[PDB]
Every structure is written in C-alpha cells, then in structure tokens.
Design a protein around this ligand. Structure first.
Ligand SMILES: [Zn+2]
Length: 70
C-alpha cells in the first residue's frame, strides 16, 4: 500500500509499505529516501505518536494516509 510522509521542511515523500510493517521498518525506508537517522525520527499520525515496535494497522493507518515527521 501507498502512504505519504511529510518531513520537517514540508517535503513529501512516498513510501510503499505493507499493513503489517512496523514503524521501525518505515523509519528505515525514510532513512534510505532522505538520509535521516532513525533515532532522530519521530512519527505522528492523527495526533498519535507512533511507537517503533507497533505496526501500521495497529494505528489504523490505511492506504494513502499521511504521516508527519516532527
Ligand atoms: Zn496533514
């Protein structure tokens, strides 16, 4: 499925992920795309802070959703 991530500069990157991907997996993909170290990445979705060991489905993140780096 496709989701979008907004960086701290407002840039929007697209990611191909699976419903079961963990936040840790997503952070690794962001690192490959932008070079931002995982440990300095904090992701938010609908006002919810996302934990590394949980999956996208755990947060009801569906196709075309947008996450924010803060
Ligand atoms: Zn938004």
């Amino acid at each position: 499925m496709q989701i979008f991530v907004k960086t701290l500069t407002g840039k929007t990157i697209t990611l191909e992920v699976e419903p079961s991907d963990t936040i840790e997996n997503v952070k690794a993909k962001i690192q490959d795309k932008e070079g931002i170290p995982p440990d300095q990445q904090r992701l938010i979705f609908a006002g919810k802070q996302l934990e590394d060991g949980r999956t996208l489905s755990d947060y009801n993140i569906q196709k075309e959703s947008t996450l924010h780096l803060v």
